[PDB]
Design a protein around this ligand. Structure first.
Ligand SMILES: *[C@@H]1O[C@H](CO)[C@@H](O[C@@H]2O[C@H](CO)[C@@H](O[C@@H]3O[C@H](CO[C@H]4O[C@H](CO)[C@@H](O)[C@H](O)[C@@H]4O)[C@@H](O)[C@H](O[C@H]4O[C@H](CO)[C@@H](O)[C@H](O)[C@@H]4O)[C@@H]3O)[C@H](O)[C@H]2NC(C)=O)[C@H](O)[C@H]1NC(C)=O
Ligand SMILES: *[C@@H]1O[C@H](CO)[C@@H](O[C@@H]2O[C@H](CO)[C@@H](O[C@@H]3O[C@H](CO[C@H]4O[C@H](CO)[C@@H](O)[C@H](O)[C@@H]4O)[C@@H](O)[C@H](O[C@H]4O[C@H](CO)[C@@H](O)[C@H](O)[C@@H]4O)[C@@H]3O)[C@H](O)[C@H]2NC(C)=O)[C@H](O)[C@H]1NC(C)=O
Ligand SMILES: *[C@@H]1O[C@H](CO)[C@@H](O[C@@H]2O[C@H](CO)[C@@H](O[C@@H]3O[C@H](CO[C@H]4O[C@H](CO)[C@@H](O)[C@H](O)[C@@H]4O)[C@@H](O)[C@H](O[C@H]4O[C@H](CO)[C@@H](O)[C@H](O)[C@@H]4O)[C@@H]3O)[C@H](O)[C@H]2NC(C)=O)[C@H](O)[C@H]1NC(C)=O
Ligand SMILES: *[C@@H]1O[C@H](CO)[C@@H](O[C@@H]2O[C@H](CO)[C@@H](O[C@@H]3O[C@H](CO)[C@@H](O)[C@H](O)[C@@H]3O)[C@H](O)[C@H]2NC(C)=O)[C@H](O)[C@H]1NC(C)=O
Ligand SMILES: *[C@@H]1O[C@H](CO)[C@@H](O[C@@H]2O[C@H](CO)[C@@H](O[C@@H]3O[C@H](CO)[C@@H](O)[C@H](O)[C@@H]3O)[C@H](O)[C@H]2NC(C)=O)[C@H](O)[C@H]1NC(C)=O
Ligand SMILES: *[C@@H]1O[C@H](CO)[C@@H](O[C@@H]2O[C@H](CO)[C@@H](O[C@@H]3O[C@H](CO)[C@@H](O)[C@H](O)[C@@H]3O)[C@H](O)[C@H]2NC(C)=O)[C@H](O)[C@H]1NC(C)=O
Ligand SMILES: *[C@@H]1O[C@H](CO[C@@H]2O[C@@H](C)[C@@H](O)[C@@H](O)[C@@H]2O)[C@@H](O[C@@H]2O[C@H](CO)[C@@H](O)[C@H](O)[C@H]2NC(C)=O)[C@H](O)[C@H]1NC(C)=O
Ligand SMILES: *[C@@H]1O[C@H](CO[C@@H]2O[C@@H](C)[C@@H](O)[C@@H](O)[C@@H]2O)[C@@H](O[C@@H]2O[C@H](CO)[C@@H](O)[C@H](O)[C@H]2NC(C)=O)[C@H](O)[C@H]1NC(C)=O
Ligand SMILES: *[C@@H]1O[C@H](CO[C@@H]2O[C@@H](C)[C@@H](O)[C@@H](O)[C@@H]2O)[C@@H](O[C@@H]2O[C@H](CO)[C@@H](O)[C@H](O)[C@H]2NC(C)=O)[C@H](O)[C@H]1NC(C)=O
Ligand SMILES: *[C@@H]1O[C@H](CO)[C@@H](O[C@@H]2O[C@H](CO)[C@@H](O)[C@H](O)[C@H]2NC(C)=O)[C@H](O)[C@H]1NC(C)=O
Ligand SMILES: *[C@@H]1O[C@H](CO)[C@@H](O[C@@H]2O[C@H](CO)[C@@H](O)[C@H](O)[C@H]2NC(C)=O)[C@H](O)[C@H]1NC(C)=O
Ligand SMILES: *[C@@H]1O[C@H](CO)[C@@H](O[C@@H]2O[C@H](CO)[C@@H](O)[C@H](O)[C@H]2NC(C)=O)[C@H](O)[C@H]1NC(C)=O
Ligand SMILES: *[C@@H]1O[C@H](CO)[C@@H](O[C@@H]2O[C@H](CO)[C@@H](O)[C@H](O)[C@H]2NC(C)=O)[C@H](O)[C@H]1NC(C)=O
Ligand SMILES: *[C@@H]1O[C@H](CO)[C@@H](O[C@@H]2O[C@H](CO)[C@@H](O)[C@H](O)[C@H]2NC(C)=O)[C@H](O)[C@H]1NC(C)=O
Ligand SMILES: *[C@@H]1O[C@H](CO)[C@@H](O[C@@H]2O[C@H](CO)[C@@H](O)[C@H](O)[C@H]2NC(C)=O)[C@H](O)[C@H]1NC(C)=O
Ligand SMILES: *[C@@H]1O[C@H](CO)[C@@H](O[C@@H]2O[C@H](CO)[C@@H](O)[C@H](O)[C@H]2NC(C)=O)[C@H](O)[C@H]1NC(C)=O
Ligand SMILES: *[C@@H]1O[C@H](CO)[C@@H](O[C@@H]2O[C@H](CO)[C@@H](O)[C@H](O)[C@H]2NC(C)=O)[C@H](O)[C@H]1NC(C)=O
Lengths: 163, 197, 163, 197, 163, 197
């Protein structure tokens, strides 16, 4: 269990069934754990607000743990890190949507489908805001249904013998 | 909507972006006239939209700031990133600064729209400042005087000044959650949008 | 039916079997309709002249419809939009090819394989030019044959029971 | 070739890039010495390659253009994008401009290759101008004096001046179809290629 | 047999079973040949040190062969070419890892799994260095095992009838 | 470890980056105080870390270099790329240059950390120079005076000068293999990290 989205040399959290978001990643409770086959999508998709935040948190952990960074935050390290980590193109797409009155991601809130029968998840995707606030799931609608189709497909392709 | 073509829950997340505080700046909104940037432990910038003025100098004493130093690192980088993200601004008197104990204090003078009512509509440097302002902090920037979407640029707000100063990091982020995104948006790409020469 | 390549909040043309190119996208006739499973490739491929034009047209439609844009074209919106939309790397590859005497895409002309027996299409790919004009299909050759192999594969993997 | 390992047709497309006219500039070729940029309804730039000269000033009065304004927006941004995409150009007399009723009129003076025949081969600012020119409009730029592929840079053409002026949008695009790509290529990345300092 | 990662107009080495690295690409011996289905990964992965070097070599060959480039190396062509060819984001990730004491790729050495029973390969991946030198395969470890799993999967999905 | 869940060998590669010599610059390390850049057939730059000084001028005569020319192309582009990749550097006396027969000779004066021992820790322009130096050539840059990882910026080395001069391309790359990566890293993105204004 290794990832390409991480800066670490496979230091951890890529092997115990999934990657867990801790209580310092989340405002609420703890340990939202996403299976490794879901998390691995962040290794190559190259366009997802959740995955981009995930890399940013991974950076933060390494930077604090290894550098200490007393007094200054080494903003110059960040300038290097963003070119390495943040998917500039996506940030600008969300910016344009705000300009244009189109629901856009402000990166704080995510949703996912949780197949609680088995515990599999789709990974978070951004919930989106418009007109100063969050969207209803009733207008968000079809994108959820489409995400469900993708999980359904995975559960069928999960069969080891074939598919 | 409950379940989605099988038994699935939405189970939403809300990220604690505050824990990113020790490595990159986080911006937020306090109220209609105030926005903030956290840059480190108990420190950050205060972005004030006002009708008053603190600095009556027409000089931006950067030749001292970058030679005598005596300034806070990181805070200087943030303001330079911000300042240089503004299109078409030269100086035009506005954007004077005074580091002689006022440290980072700089002000943009949005009043240079001239006349009154929308004046230099789609041309004032003030809009360049407002658009940059709304990238420095965004999402929660909507309660600032910029009002109405689908109306890109040509904002022409009623505040006369944007004042940026160093503050302590008190619990300022009352209107919107802190986020690294504003800074990252200004930093990333920039889009140049130079205008000049 | 939703897309990631679009700026719209799934406003339309992602659900009625495919996405149609209208008479204002095309110089000739109307409604060149590409099935949704083909169009969806533009959601993640991240390197295709046709998909890049598709996003640019989607932008244009939204910008005109929602902003009106009297007097000025808001070139400054464009500067933001291109960083969000145009795949700079590909544009430069076509530029180098022009410098180097290598056939390159000037983005006006595209070709696709149309399996007219069933109506499925491969999506357009750029036809390419060299020495001031368009290439012959006889030298273009093998790339067409390779595209056919991909459609053949899809038609076999289309089987729902397995593959 | 008809069918391709099953029954398939090529069914080609030709995109109507003109309909993109109201949001971003479109460049094209009219004939060997003329290229054009559409920037809006019935308006755009004329790019002229000539041996004559209109502007004999050695000043580029940008300090007036960006202070007194009185200039067309967007057209100014396009010329600044173009101008700043040229490598190694400073001024060197060339690239003077006059906005006192001639508005955007600017000229590049390609004659600064000096001497005659290929002169400052692989070094003249003129090549920097020609390479930028051929990005502003491209594909259909091949009928300009740049001739031969596989010969990168060191073009050394026979025209002495590149003159850029504001025009009306007549049906100028006779040699090549209008395209946003030229502008996007200059805008995107740029490649900097600064040379200076 | 055509590639998207190449600048050439399918000039060669995309059809004879695979793409060969010659003695001027390699310091040692000659003709390290990677099957076309492996090489094709460089067409879309968009994040691999080996593939990035591969494109850089392809450029070099075309630039020398077609331009001659006497006296000067046309550094200005390179400035255009890198924006077209080098995956800036990856370079910066390896740079950060050096800063951070995390094993990183300095791009000289690669490893791959060679299924010598059949001759299939995984394509090279960077070997990595830390503390001034190369890593041991014993700490590199699991990433090799994971690469083997991927080849195993391919060999099973290779079945033509299904999978 | 031999085989990996079936019969597999590692079969490693070591790329001959030297063959890239005719199209883009290759940097390497010779020993602790010397690094090199190949730019063409039998030519390249010598990067020297020393305690001595060759150029006592406080002028960088770029106004001559870019007007009178008489300089080597490509070598000039590399030094400009390098120079402009340094954050917060203005001139501050340091970085003077003399092209009057010394051609590219330029020197950075790392001694402007002032005082002694770590002095302007996390603020000296010298660190800006060292960090740029370690991107121009990297991997094999670790034997330079920069010492210890996990200690970003605030390097404060003991050499007083970085001197860059044109040399012949002898077999200089004894400590590390030549690589295009250093140049590409400086060229690509840059990260700007301007500081100034
Ligand atoms: C993305 O966009 C969303 C949508 O606008 C933003 O969400 C808002 O975030 C702010 C800041 O966290 C929230 O502000 C809080 O409002 C409370 C008001 O209470 C009433 O309304 C809530 C609404 O949920 C009811 O549950 C409640 O019963 C009441 O009826 C205040 O009480 C809060 O004060 C507490 O926190 C502050 C934090 O600084 C402390 O200083 C106070 O002492 C106190 O402990 C707070 O002011 C706002 O409610 C959110 N709106 C919505 C719709 O969720 C995101 O922040 C934005 N994301 C980013 C990163 O920009
Ligand atoms: C990508 O690269 C291609 C290849 O060079 C460019 O294609 C050319 O585009 C131009 C402009 O649209 C075409 O110019 C036209 O030439 C006609 C000449 O007629 C003879 O040749 C054609 C060739 O197909 C025969 O069919 C015909 O029977 C004749 O033998 C003119 O009659 C046209 O004039 C009409 O349109 C203009 C438009 O401004 C009007 O002003 C006129 O009044 C009139 O209505 C026109 O001049 C050229 O033929 C195309 N060549 C090829 C090989 O297709 C692409 O434009 C370029 N794409 C981009 C975006 O740059
Ligand atoms: C990525 O990171 C790696 C790891 O540090 C770098 O690898 C080093 O590269 C240099 C330059 O090629 C190698 O330097 C050579 O050292 C030899 C010393 O011999 C002893 O050590 C070797 C170690 O393998 C034993 O095999 C040997 O038996 C001895 O015990 C010298 O003899 C070599 O000299 C020859 O080549 C030079 C080239 O300029 C000629 O001038 C000489 O005349 C002579 O022919 C040479 O100095 C070093 O050994 C490598 N280390 C390791 C661990 O492999 C990569 O270069 C770096 N990649 C990039 C692109 O930066
Ligand atoms: C996706 O859905 C699964 C299934 O509902 C979630 O797993 C469940 O998570 C809760 C909260 O963490 C666990 O509750 C536990 O209860 C005991 C007391 O009974 C308490 O001591 C623990 O501290 C905890 O609160 C619950 O057991 C667990 N369910 C299973 C089957 O393990 C999962 O959290 C959801 N999403 C993600 C991203 O993890
Ligand atoms: C891919 O191939 C299919 C199959 O050939 C194409 O569909 C066909 O398109 C034509 C032109 O739009 C349709 O012709 C119609 O004829 C009637 C009169 O008979 C006229 O009134 C209509 O206005 C139109 O001209 C034709 O019916 C249609 N075929 C089928 C089976 O529906 C398709 O257009 C090709 N490519 C793409 C990208 O759509
Ligand atoms: C992946 O593994 C295969 C199988 O081991 C490698 O193919 C083998 O490569 C060697 C060296 O090129 C060939 O040796 C030849 O020996 C004759 C004399 O017996 C000599 O005249 C030739 O010049 C050459 O040295 C060996 O025959 C060949 N094996 C087979 C079955 O063809 C392959 O090179 C490895 N990796 C890659 C990336 O190619
Ligand atoms: C900050 O801006 C003010 C201008 O503020 C307003 O808008 C002007 C167009 C004008 O209508 C003022 O009365 C409004 O208060 C600068 O003060 C004046 O600037 C104008 C030129 O635009 C000049 O003619 C006046 O004489 C100036 N006022 C005085 C008392 O001399 C002010 O100087 C700017 N300050 C800085 C630091 O930029
Ligand atoms: C535009 O360029 C001309 C130079 O044009 C040609 O190339 C020169 C090298 C020379 O051979 C001229 O005769 C050719 O016509 C500028 O005019 C001359 O510039 C040279 C310096 O290069 C100077 O010695 C001459 O005295 C100038 N001519 C006159 C009559 O004084 C011209 O000034 C340039 N104009 C602008 C606005 O840049
Ligand atoms: C290159 O730098 C030296 C400074 O070198 C050292 O560090 C200084 C802080 C000081 O302690 C010197 O004694 C050390 O040798 C420049 O020389 C001196 O600069 C200081 C100002 O920093 C000035 O007060 C001294 O008078 C200068 N020395 C003399 C003999 O006048 C030197 O000028 C720099 N050269 C260039 C081209 O930049
Ligand atoms: C945002 O909150 C700040 C702090 O509470 C307000 O600023 C203060 O307002 C009181 C009003 O009586 C003044 O007495 C203080 O002197 C102000 N302090 C500072 C530092 O300015 C601010 O006015 C609020 N803004 C809005 C729009 O409500
Ligand atoms: C700052 O002072 C100016 C006057 O110098 C105010 O300008 C206008 O005030 C009227 C009445 O309140 C409004 O209806 C206009 O719309 C204002 N001008 C603009 C451009 O909007 C201005 O409102 C004052 N600003 C604030 C925030 O109080
Ligand atoms: C903005 O920064 C200045 C500079 O550090 C702060 O002023 C200093 O406060 C300390 C408090 O112990 C004094 O000892 C220094 O003498 C002050 N320096 C100067 C130049 O006066 C200022 O307080 C900061 N602003 C805020 C709101 O915290
Ligand atoms: C490109 O077309 C333009 C417009 O038709 C040509 O410019 C005109 O040429 C006539 C020739 O008799 C002159 O009388 C006009 O004064 C010119 N007008 C302008 C605005 O310059 C131009 O010469 C053509 N270029 C080529 C290469 O054929
Ligand atoms: C502009 O005038 C110059 C002379 O001042 C012409 O320069 C040369 O003319 C001869 C004869 O026509 C050509 O064979 C040379 O190749 C031209 N010089 C260069 C650098 O090519 C120039 O041709 C005239 N330009 C045009 C387009 O008419
Ligand atoms: C380039 O722009 C100028 C400035 O608008 C145009 O000249 C104006 O034309 C109108 C026509 O009604 C006159 O009322 C203005 O007085 C003119 N302005 C100036 C400064 O003279 C010029 O025509 C444009 N060029 C072209 C070819 O359209
Ligand atoms: C260059 O000369 C300076 C003195 O002008 C040397 O500075 C210090 O020397 C002592 C004794 O060798 C060291 O322990 C200090 O650590 C040095 N200063 C710094 C900032 O490290 C300096 O060592 C000489 N440089 C070299 C490479 O010989
Ligand atoms: C750095 O470049 C200069 C300039 O070319 C080299 O000096 C020249 O060497 C040739 C040798 O035949 C002489 O004919 C020239 O007269 C010299 N020029 C000057 C200005 O003196 C210098 O040798 C190069 N440095 C190295 C180490 O090769």
């Amino acid at each position: 269990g290794t990832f390409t989205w991480t800066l670490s040399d496979s230091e951890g959290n890529a092997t115990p069934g999934g990657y867990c978001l801790t209580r310092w990643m989340l405002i609420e409770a703890e340990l939202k754990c996403f299976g490794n086959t879901a998390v691995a999508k962040c290794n190559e998709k190259h366009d997802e607000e959740f995955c981009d935040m995930l890399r940013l948190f991974d950076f933060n952990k390494q930077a604090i743990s290894r550098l200490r960074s007393p007094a200054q935050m080494s903003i110059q390290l960040i300038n290097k890190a963003v070119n390495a980590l943040i998917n500039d193109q996506l940030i600008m797409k969300n910016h344009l949507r705000d300009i244009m009155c189109i629901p856009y991601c402000n990166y704080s809130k995510y949703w996912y489908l949780n197949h609680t029968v088995t515990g599999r998840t789709s990974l978070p995707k951004c919930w989106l805001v418009s007109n100063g606030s969050y969207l209803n799931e009733t207008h968000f609608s079809d994108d959820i249904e489409q995400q469900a189709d993708n999980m359904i497909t995975e559960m069928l392709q999960k069969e080891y013998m074939d598919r | 909507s409950n379940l989605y073509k099988g038994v699935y829950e939405l189970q939403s997340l809300d990220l604690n972006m505050e824990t990113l505080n020790m490595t990159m700046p986080l911006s937020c909104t306090k109220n209609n006239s105030h926005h903030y940037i956290r840059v480190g432990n108990e420190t950050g910038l205060e972005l004030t939209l006002t009708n008053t003025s603190l600095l009556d100098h027409k000089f931006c004493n950067l030749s001292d700031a970058h030679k005598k130093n005596l300034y806070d690192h990181a805070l200087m980088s943030i303001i330079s990133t911000f300042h240089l993200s503004i299109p078409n601004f030269n100086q035009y008197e506005a954007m004077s600064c005074d580091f002689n104990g006022g440290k980072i204090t700089v002000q943009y003078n949005l009043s240079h729209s001239y006349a009154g009512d929308a004046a230099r509509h789609c041309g004032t440097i003030a809009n360049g400042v407002l658009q940059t302002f709304m990238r420095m902090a965004w999402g929660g920037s909507y309660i600032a005087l910029d009002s109405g979407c689908g109306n890109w640029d040509c904002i022409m707000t009623s505040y006369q000044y944007l004042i940026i100063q160093n503050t302590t990091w008190e619990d300022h982020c009352q209107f919107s959650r802190p986020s690294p995104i504003g800074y990252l948006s200004l930093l990333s790409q920039r889009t140049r949008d130079i205008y000049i020469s």
